[PDB]
Design an enzyme around this catalytic site. Structure first.
Site, PDB file in Angstrom:
ATOM      1  N   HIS B 348       0.869  -1.199  -0.087  1.00 48.68           N
ATOM      2  CA  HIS B 348       0.127   0.022  -0.042  1.00 48.68           C
ATOM      3  C   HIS B 348       0.722   1.417  -0.015  1.00 48.68           C
ATOM      4  O   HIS B 348       0.354   2.401   0.158  1.00 48.68           O
ATOM      5  CB  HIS B 348      -0.738   0.064   1.125  1.00 48.68           C
ATOM      6  CG  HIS B 348      -1.805  -1.126   1.260  1.00 48.68           C
ATOM      7  ND1 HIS B 348      -3.151  -1.063   0.781  1.00 48.68           N
ATOM      8  CD2 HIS B 348      -1.863  -2.375   1.912  1.00 48.68           C
ATOM      9  CE1 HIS B 348      -3.803  -2.175   0.909  1.00 48.68           C
ATOM     10  NE2 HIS B 348      -3.146  -3.105   1.541  1.00 48.68           N
ATOM     11  N   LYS B 539      -8.497  13.758   4.899  1.00 44.07           N
ATOM     12  CA  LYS B 539      -7.615  12.545   4.657  1.00 44.07           C
ATOM     13  C   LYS B 539      -6.852  12.686   5.889  1.00 44.07           C
ATOM     14  O   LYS B 539      -6.632  13.819   6.677  1.00 44.07           O
ATOM     15  CB  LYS B 539      -6.699  12.780   3.477  1.00 44.07           C
ATOM     16  CG  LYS B 539      -6.219  13.947   3.040  1.00 44.07           C
ATOM     17  CD  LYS B 539      -5.515  13.853   1.655  1.00 44.07           C
ATOM     18  CE  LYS B 539      -6.479  13.999   0.733  1.00 44.07           C
ATOM     19  NZ  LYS B 539      -6.362  12.970  -0.239  1.00 44.07           N
TER      20      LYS B 539
END
Ligand code: GPK
Ligand code: GPK
Lengths: 807, 807
Positions: B348, B539
């Site tokens: 990721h 975020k």
């Protein structure tokens, strides 16, 4: 099947069944193919719980409307045991659920064995709290049990090579279907900080906050549709290394983690004192909140009663002063009047090591405002003493709530007497001892405060639930009313010469003994003769209770068999059970001696099946429900003056065991109710013990003059019961010989002789049984219904009521 | 009310109502007069949960019979959010429950706001796990989410004087109605000990035992009657000062106490490593158990797929070897074949500080057998490298799972590649970067292992649930099928010139903005103009995400207004939200800068309502469901090459925001799907960043050549945004000037200019909206249904199925 277990209606069984299936499916998320017996227990438990809630909601609303005086029973211990059968019994659902589960192809009895005990207590004091709640509910009192929801109850006892081993009692692993968390009623509790003085008064500031979250458990009355509440507090951290700060939340929540396992022994640990304040602070706020929902504290005592179960919640007194003076701004004298009129104190012991005496340095740090309030309570109290007994300076030091010494201590008992309108002992002899000895001074000052309230046990759990056979045969002859009016058992006295009743009483006893013998074999691989006399002593292990005296008798019988093997002796199974507090060295040694005696006695082929000595592991409420109905002989052999009341004694009387005991605690009243002829009394009275103490107790004297005793001591010293460790028991012998506070040798001779009279009566089954009937018939006084009625009328100022609420 | 929320049947509403009342009464033990809204939420939650269990039980039994290959998704994070509305949506109960609650006089929407988020994750990686489970269930895969039931999820963020403050997220205070404890499936997990060698093999002995207790949470598919399971493990102490020993049980149970709050940053703490093993050990036993209920491990990989969500559960690999070799006694090579064929790895990130590199001294102590297995894996692996690239000694040090240094470390990524048959990145550009940069060596050795699986989001939560207005108008024109086949949104492309659709799209956006503006005022006393452009960046706070670049733009607009106050500017509300990891100093400073900018900008009267800067507190899943539908402009401005994929970006595209962003992660594929003309792209590509690094990045250069930038820096240094602490932001300026790893100044010019093009399009509502429609219409690829179908077919070897199971 049996009449006292209620009706199995066609409508009811069908309803119970479909609700059982609904819970198995929706609540447990299982189908019939994966369910284990534990899933089955939970489905039944959830089904029976549904029958409570309607009544629970109605009872609480009924009190809101009628606004009666509320009773608050404050206790650090609630020794509840299992809830399922007790709930069925009080709701008349037992036969219905039996039928319903049977048709589903289940055995309800094996389902009942899956429930963990709520072991939130140590022994007698904790169990009295539980019997009390049942009786309060059965008598329609608007009563609340308040305590701590301990994450770990009393430890589970394992025996390993004869030694006690302790295991954490993880009673909540699988969930508790009986409780309802009420996070919406969470309350702040304060610790540490310091006291500020302002113009408008004292202020307690810079405190650490711990949150108290309540859990409600329903307490159903006997067939009256009353359901009261037991509210138990859990410790929660407030929300304000990051990781470490989160992990350290467990410091605040440790308060409600574990029950302290000392019984009749004080330990001055800080975590214990935190526990005591926590329950008192959260409870009083709840009490005050409820009172405001119905400014004027003059009526407070007409609306509130607070009962203190020993000195454990003694901080109730200065906490109530604190709230009333510091927060509600009432003047001192008025607040003090409210306090005394509200609080009442029950003492459970006269053993000096058992009394709570808190170091001032602990209270100073932890509760600095409460210490100030206590000093002020003390000053004003001592001014009343000085005024009533002028010049008696000695009285003043004896009576002070503050004990002087190298470490200053607060005597919590002295605090309770000063701040309470009533002080009671728990049996008549114990209440008299309080007035003559440790509270003499206080009694001379305020004679009207002192009362007796002889203990009791609930006939629901202690007869109907554990002994359905005996309850049934009684109900056949005299009806069912006695279950909530135990004095009616006196009618049984006209059946003492009835041949059919005699056989039925004896039949039930044989059945209980067969069942328990089979439990011993199945669950513990232990191998007993059910035709022997069942000689049982079950209670916590403590020197004052004299399990050792029992031990010496057991050894005497064994030495008598070995001396004359071919002579007839009435066979006995001697069963001793109880837990020892983990740090009580002597108590642990006593357990090891008992198993050591069993190792020798049980494998001697000459003995045969004539003498068996069994240690009953992990004695607890649910084990007592099994062994008590199975008992023939109840052992209650505490040194006179040491057992405040006893309650086991009443459980056995009620269940058809005869009692061998000293004139101690409630023994005196039981023998008085049944007639001394129907009781096996032996040993020193209180007066005799006193004489021995003045003169000096020299155990050597008994050792020199009794050959049978000398032989036992020699066997203990020489390693007869410990061949691998010949000196294993030198602590016991040393103690028995040089510093036995409880005079085990002084009662030995009279004990052994009295034990022979028991064997003699046991040879004549018919006369044994008639004596049993005379005990059972007069055990009515020892109902906690009687006890609570007396608290209600003579302390709380409320009238009990046997009237049904509607469903 | 609205069509996509299902039928409100007369039969259904009546049933929902009576079950609601049954739960209020029996489950909550409340009557209508004492119930609070929280009681109402719980009654609804228990009612909706009843509709799941039938389907849950049937789904699990269906897999038992059909025995399909099982998918095991191992993750330390499951960022679930709220469950109630999502459950209603997937079961078609939403209108029915709306009606049912309305008739009871309740507002379902205000009831939904009482549910706590299950915040068991940090951000993108955790939320991907949650979208995945929904998609797996919707596609009929026999799939299991496995993780840790954290007692405390991600911390709650408070802002105090502009600074982040962390609060424990006590999400379980009031209970979780969605989970079912399964104490009957508790499993032992081992730690510490030592390795013994015998004749018959290695033995791991003298271990500390921690128990893993599972909790099952249902995961319903979209209207297909499939309900899968998320199983989460809780740490429990085994049952073997007494007090202190009981209190110390919390040491073992700390394992599952708290989620680590670092995102994209590795921290080598022991408690974290314990967490990783705990989930892996308990899960693998469960996996193996389930496999044995249907000797022969050759078929293991045909029956089991294990997906590793990053390297967090990398210990799955040596644990599986351990069980197979040490306990099941298979030979090494055969066990290794099974392992590789079973495991697959998803990466990721390429940020070096984010990669897990565990000190050998930790593994040695904690997991001594696993270290041995790893050394052996390494030796054998390196022998394959040596054989394929003879003499290339440098390759051998680069590829080793063991990194040499003053402290030896295990590179957990290298372990995952070696022990997995498939390695995937999460967007095409990210997967290419893996093959060219950090895993080049591994790719050259085993090119067939490397794959792409571009991320996706679930259209159920991310459209139907949070944006019913938009889903509705889409359903009017094209039907309902697109909800589980998001490619159909492409049909919307024939409505781009349709006047009625244009007005409806714009109407829904205005409604979402009005609602969110009212949420800002009610819940936070914040006071915004709903006619302004909603410029949102939400975020986690990280330097690579470049909230700072956004900050500089905001300051530029403010300086442009102040220079020419009477000139027209398109008004904006700039909203920035996100959490900072507690120890990430810079990240915390960035939050303070943002609020500092708001302090100045929001109270300047010359600005008016033309520019507002709001910090959105406590950004979490349930806040994203509210702000995303309200957004006009989506900010995705990470330095090219740093954001692996992004998933927020897809949420905004789906909900009618236009995107300004760099050619980074999934941005590249979104722009490719919508057409570059329909996207606001700016800044360096990956290739440009590379060029800048070879040459050297000198920020001074941008400061010298751009007056507007110089002014901002001077304002930051001189204390314009911090008058009381003139030097408060010197860390930021220093970093921006001398060691900015993410080249904020390099993109500043192109960013500002691109931002002007956005304001320009926004002046023409009709053309703005037509561009919106072109985004929404091509957002279909970014459904997690597509993602999972690709994992299933290309990694797991199972065929998805859209077929309904019966009810
Ligand atoms: O700490 C104690 N624990 C305990 O169980 N008690 C018992 O309390 C019982 C209830 O009053 C009495 O019957 C009994 O005589 C007395 O020992 C008394 C105490 F002080
Ligand atoms: O520690 C991490 N936390 C995290 O949220 N992720 C994210 O994982 C998301 C899911 O793949 C990506 O879209 C995103 O680009 C990436 O940063 C990647 C990590 F390595």
């Amino acid at each position: 099947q049996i009449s006292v277990r209620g009706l199995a209606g066609v409508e009811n069984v069908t309803e119970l069944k479909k609700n059982f299936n609904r819970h198995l499916h929706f609540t447990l998320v299982k189908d019939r193919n994966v369910a284990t017996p534990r899933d089955y227990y939970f489905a039944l438990a959830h089904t029976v719980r549904d029958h409570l809630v309607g009544r629970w909601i109605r009872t609480q609303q009924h009190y809101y409307e009628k606004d009666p005086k509320r009773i608050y029973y404050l206790s650090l211990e609630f020794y509840m045991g299992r809830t399922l059968q007790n709930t069925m019994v009080n709701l008349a659902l037992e036969n219905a659920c039996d039928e319903a589960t049977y048709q589903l192809g289940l055995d309800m009895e094996e389902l009942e064995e899956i429930e963990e005990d709520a072991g939130l207590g140590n022994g007698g004091l904790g169990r009295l709290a539980a019997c009390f709640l049942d009786s309060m509910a059965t008598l329609g009192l608007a009563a609340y049990g308040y305590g701590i929801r301990y994450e770990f109850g009393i430890f589970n006892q394992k025996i390993c090579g004869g030694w006690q081993m302790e295991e954490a009692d993880d009673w909540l692993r699988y969930g508790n279907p009986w409780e309802k968390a009420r996070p919406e009623f969470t309350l702040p509790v304060h610790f540490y900080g310091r006291v500020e003085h302002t113009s408008q008064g004292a202020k307690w500031v810079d405190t650490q906050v711990v949150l108290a979250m309540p859990y409600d458990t329903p307490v159903p009355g006997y067939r009256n549709n009353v359901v009261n509440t037991m509210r138990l507090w859990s410790a929660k951290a407030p929300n304000d290394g990051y990781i470490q700060a989160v992990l350290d939340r467990n410091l605040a929540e440790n308060i409600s983690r574990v029950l302290y396992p000392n019984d009749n022994f004080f330990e001055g640990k800080e975590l214990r004192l935190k526990q005591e304040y926590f329950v008192v602070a959260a409870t009083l706020q709840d009490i005050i909140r409820r009172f405001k929902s119905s400014t004027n504290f003059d009526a407070f005592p007409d609306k509130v009663a607070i009962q203190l179960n020993d000195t454990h919640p003694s901080l109730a007194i200065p906490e109530l002063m604190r709230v009333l003076v510091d927060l509600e701004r009432l003047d001192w004298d008025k607040a003090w009047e409210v306090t005394v009129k509200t609080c009442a104190y029950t003492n459970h012991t006269v053993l000096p090591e058992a009394l709570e005496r808190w170091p001032v340095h602990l209270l100073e740090t932890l509760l600095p405002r409460h210490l100030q309030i206590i000093y002020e309570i003390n000053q004003r109290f001592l001014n009343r003493v000085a005024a009533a007994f002028p010049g008696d300076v000695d009285r003043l030091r004896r009576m002070s709530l503050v004990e002087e010494g190298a470490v200053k201590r607060i005597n919590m008992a002295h605090l309770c007497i000063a701040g309470s309108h009533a002080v009671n002992g728990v049996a008549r002899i114990h209440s008299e001892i309080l007035k003559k000895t440790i509270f003499k001074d206080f009694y001379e000052l305020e004679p009207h405060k002192f009362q007796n309230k002889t203990n009791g046990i609930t006939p629901r759990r202690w007869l109907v639930l554990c002994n359905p056979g005996l309850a049934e045969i009684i109900a056949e002859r005299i009806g069912e009313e006695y279950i909530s009016d135990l004095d009616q058992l006196r009618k049984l006295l006209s059946y003492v010469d009835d041949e059919a009743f005699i056989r039925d009483v004896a039949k039930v006893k044989q059945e209980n003994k067969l069942k328990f013998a089979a439990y011993l074999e199945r669950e513990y691989k232990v191998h007993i003769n059910p035709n022997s006399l069942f000689d049982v002593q079950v209670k916590r292990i403590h020197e004052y209770k004299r399990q050792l005296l029992n031990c010496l008798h057991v050894i005497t019988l064994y030495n008598r068999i070995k001396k004359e093997p071919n002579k007839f002796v009435v066979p006995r199974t001697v069963m001793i059970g109880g837990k020892a507090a983990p740090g009580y060295h002597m108590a642990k040694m006593i357990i090891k001696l008992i198993t050591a005696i069993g190792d020798v006695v049980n494998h001697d082929p000459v003995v045969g099946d004539r003498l068996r000595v069994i240690f009953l592991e992990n004695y607890r409420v649910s084990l007592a429900e099994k062994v008590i109905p199975a008992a023939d002989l109840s052992e209650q052999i505490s040194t006179a003056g040491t057992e405040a009341s006893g309650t086991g004694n009443m459980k056995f009387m009620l269940n058809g065991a005869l009692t061998i005991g000293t004139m101690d605690g409630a023994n005196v009243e039981m023998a008085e109710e049944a007639g001394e002829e129907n009781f096996f009394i032996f040993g020193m009275r209180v007066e005799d013990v006193d004489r021995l103490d003045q003169r000096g107790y020299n155990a050597q004297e008994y050792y020199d003059r009794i050959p049978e005793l000398r032989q036992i001591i020699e066997q203990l010293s020489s390693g007869f019961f410990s061949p691998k460790q010949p000196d294993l028991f030198k602590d016991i012998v040393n103690m028995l010989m040089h510093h036995d506070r409880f005079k085990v040798f002084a009662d030995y001779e009279e004990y052994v002789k009295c034990q022979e009279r028991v064997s003699a009566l046991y040879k004549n089954p018919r006369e044994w049984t008639r004596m049993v009937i005379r005990n059972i018939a007069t055990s009515g006084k020892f109902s906690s219904d009687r006890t609570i009625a007396q608290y209600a009328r003579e302390i709380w100022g409320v009238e009990p009521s046997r009237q049904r609420l509607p469903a």
